[PDB]
Design a binder for this molecule. Structure first.
Ligand SMILES: Cc1cc2nc3c(=O)[nH]c(=O)nc-3n(C[C@H](O)[C@H](O)[C@H](O)COP(=O)(O)O)c2cc1C
Ligand SMILES: Cc1cc2nc3c(=O)[nH]c(=O)nc-3n(C[C@H](O)[C@H](O)[C@H](O)COP(=O)(O)O)c2cc1C
Ligand SMILES: O=C(O)c1[nH]c(=O)[nH]c(=O)c1I
Ligand SMILES: O=C(O)c1[nH]c(=O)[nH]c(=O)c1I
Lengths: 313, 313
C-alpha cells in the first residue's frame, strides 16, 4: 500500500502539497514546507518586483473556511528564482514555482529567466491565471481571449512543460470553452483546479462589519465552503482534458476530501486553508487518513481509483 | 415591535419568503406557504407547457447545504397564472410569480398574458435569468448581450414593474457590467441575489458515486456553502443599483443570517435549502430570532440597518 506517484518526469512520495500562497512566501516558509511530509511544494505567486500587498486585516478563517484579499504580497521573482536555483533541495521533494504577473509582458519577462533554471534544476512552473484580489485586474481566465494570449506568449517565450492555476467556473459552456483553450496548448501539462471562489463577503454579526479591510470586505473564499465547487472543476477538466494532468485544490481538510478529489480525477492534491489553520503537521494526518481509506477499500495504489467517480445510470 | 414593511406598492408583515422552487410547485404547496407566517411567497419557476423535469434522484441535502438539478419541473404557466388570478388569497400576503422560459420568445409569450392579471391582482413577476440546470441552456445572465435582449423584450411586452433572479457573480467587472445592464431598465424594480451556485459536484465517499443522477452529478448548490457568496452579491448590487430594491437569497438558516443579508442591503430575504429541510415552521423561528437580534441591538426598524454594513477605513 502506496501513495507514491511518478509524474511530469518527477517522483513524489505522496500527492499532497501546499496550495500556492500558503506557507511559501519566505525562505523560512519554504524550508518548513520542505521539511514537512508533503510530496511537494509550490512557492508564493510572485511578481517581477517585490510587493507589500494589501492592508491588514487581509485574511480571516472560520469554521467553514477562509476569505482573503492578500493582494499578491511576495518577495519578488528574483527571490523565488534564486530559491529554485541555489537554495532548494530537490533530493527532498519537487518544487513548483508560481508566477502571477499583472500583464502578459510581465509574465513573459519572468518565464524567459525561469527557463534555464527549469532546464537545469527541473523546477516546474505554475502560471497563475486567477488572482481575484488586485483591483481593476479582473481574472485573466474569466476572459477567454486574454487567456489565449497569455498561453501563446508564455508557451512561445518559455517553450517548456508548465501548468496553469485556474479559477472556478460555474457554467457548462465555460467549462467547454476554457477546456478547449487549454487543449490548444500542448505545453500545458497540468491544470490546477481551483483558485479561491472570487469576491465573497463575510460579515460579522456582532460588530456589523466586514472582516477584511481591502476592497470593502470582498475577497476569495476557500475551505469547506468550496469543496463541491472544487470537485466539479477538477472533474470537468479531467473529462475535458484527457491528455493533461489535473491537480486538485479546494476544501481539503482530510484524507476523505483528498479521496474525493482523486476520484474526481486529481493527481496532486493541494491544501490551502486547512494548512494555514492547522500547520504543516496536517500532511502526516492526511496521508494516514487516505491510506486508511484505501486499506478499508482494498485499493493499493492511487491509479486504481483516480478518475473513477461513478455516475448514476 | 413588529417587522412589517412596504415595497413595490404592497405591504408585507415581515421580510421573509420562500426561495423560488421550494415548497411552491403545486396548489397544495402554495396553500401551505400561504398559511405559513411568511411575509410573501413565490411560485415555482414555470414554462409555457408542463415539464416533468430531470430524472431522480435530483435533489440531495447535507449538513452544509444542498445540490440540485431539478430541471425546471413545473405545472405549466397556465396553472400558476390561474393560481394567481383565481385562487390566491391576496388578503393574506403578496404573491410573486417566477417565469423561466427557455428563450426570449417563450418569456415574452408568458408575460403578455401575466400583464392583465398583474394589473388586476398585483401579482409580481420575478424573471428567472439564472437556471444553471437545463442541458444546452446555460445561465442567461452570464451572457450580458442575451440578458440585455431578454430585458428589452420583456420590458416592451410587459410594460409593468418586475424583478430579476440573478445568478451569483465572482468578479468585480461582472458586477459592474451586470448592474449597468440592469440599470438600463427602469421597469426592473427588484433584483434577487442569488440563484444557486452553479454546477457543483457532490461525491459520496463510501459509494464512490455522485449523488444526483442528471448531468453526471453536476447541480446547483444552496445552503451554508453559499452564504458568503450571496452576501457579496446582495451587497454588490445594493451599492451598484441605488434606485432598485435587492432581495437576498442564499444560505439563510437563522435570524442572524437574515440580519446579515439585510445589513448587506436586502429588502426581502428568501429561504430555500433551510425551508426545504425544516419545513414552513422555519418562518416563525426566523422572525423570533431576527426580532431578538434587533432588540438586543436597539433597532426598531429594518430601515435602520438595511445596507449599513460597515467597512474598515
Ligand atoms: C492566504 C491565501 C493566499 C493565497 N495565495 C495564493 C497565491 O499566491 N497564488 C495562488 O494561485 N493561489 C493562492 N491562494 C488560493 C489557494 O492557492 C487555493 O487556490 C484556495 O485557497 C482554495 O483552496 P483551499 O480551499 O484549500 O483554501 C491563496 C489562498 C489563501 C487563503
Ligand atoms: C429544489 C430547489 C428548487 C429550486 N427551484 C428554483 C426555481 O424554480 N427558480 C429559481 O429561480 N430558483 C430555484 N432554486 C434556487 C433557490 O431559489 C435559491 O435561489 C437557492 O437555493 C439559494 O438559496 P438557499 O441557499 O436558501 O438554498 C431552487 C433551489 C432548490 C434547492
Ligand atoms: O491575494 C493573493 O495573494 C491571492 N489570493 C488568492 O486567493 N488567490 C491568488 O491567486 C492570490 I495572487
Ligand atoms: O432545476 C431547477 O428547477 C432549478 N434549480 C435551481 O437551483 N435554480 C433554478 O433556477 C431552477 I429553474
Amino acid at each position: 500500500m502506496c501513495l507514491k506517484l511518478n509524474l511530469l518526469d518527477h517522483v513524489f512520495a505522496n500527492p499532497f502539497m501546499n496550495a500556492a500562497g500558503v506557507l511559501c512566501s519566505t525562505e523560512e516558509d519554504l524550508r518548513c514546507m520542505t521539511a514537512s511530509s508533503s510530496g511537494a511544494l509550490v512557492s508564493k505567486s510572485c511578481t517581477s518586483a517585490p510587493r507589500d500587498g494589501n492592508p491588514e486585516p487581509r485574511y480571516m478563517a472560520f469554521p467553514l473556511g477562509s476569505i482573503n484579499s492578500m493582494g499578491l504580497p511576495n518577495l519578488g521573482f528574483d527571490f523565488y528564482l534564486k530559491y529554485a536555483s541555489d537554495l532548494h533541495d530537490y533530493s527532498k521533494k519537487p518544487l513548483f514555482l508560481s508566477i502571477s504577473g499583472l500583464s502578459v509582458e510581465e509574465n513573459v519577462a519572468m518565464v524567459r529567466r525561469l527557463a534555464p533554471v527549469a532546464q537545469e534544476k527541473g523546477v516546474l512552473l505554475e502560471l497563475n491565471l486567477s488572482c481575484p484580489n488586485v483591483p481593476g485586474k479582473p481574472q485573466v481566465a474569466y476572459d477567454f481571449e486574454a487567456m489565449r494570449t497569455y498561453l501563446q506568449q508564455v508557451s512561445l517565450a518559455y517553450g517548456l512543460p508548465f501548468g496553469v492555476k485556474m479559477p472556478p467556473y460555474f457554467d457548462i459552456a465555460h467549462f467547454d470553452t476554457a477546456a478547449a483553450v487549454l487543449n490548444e496548448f500542448p505545453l500545458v501539462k497540468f491544470v490546477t483546479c481551483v483558485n479561491s471562489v472570487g469576491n465573497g463577503l463575510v460579515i460579522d454579526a456582532e460588530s456589523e462589519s466586514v472582516v477584511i479591510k481591502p476592497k470593502q470586505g470582498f475577497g476569495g473564499l476557500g475551505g469547506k465552503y468550496i469543496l463541491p465547487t472544487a470537485l466539479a472543476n477538477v472533474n470537468a477538466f479531467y473529462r475535458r482534458c484527457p491528455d493533461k494532468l489535473v491537480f486538485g485544490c479546494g476544501g481539503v481538510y482530510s484524507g476523505e476530501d483528498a479521496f474525493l478529489h482523486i476520484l474526481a480525477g486529481a493527481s496532486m492534491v493541494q491544501v490551502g486553508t486547512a494548512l494555514q489553520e492547522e500547520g504543516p503537521g496536517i500532511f502526516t494526518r492526511l496521508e494516514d487518513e487516505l491510506l486508511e481509506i484505501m486499506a478499508r477499500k482494498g485499493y493499493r495504489t492511487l491509479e486504481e481509483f483516480r478518475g473513477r467517480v461513478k455516475t448514476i445510470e
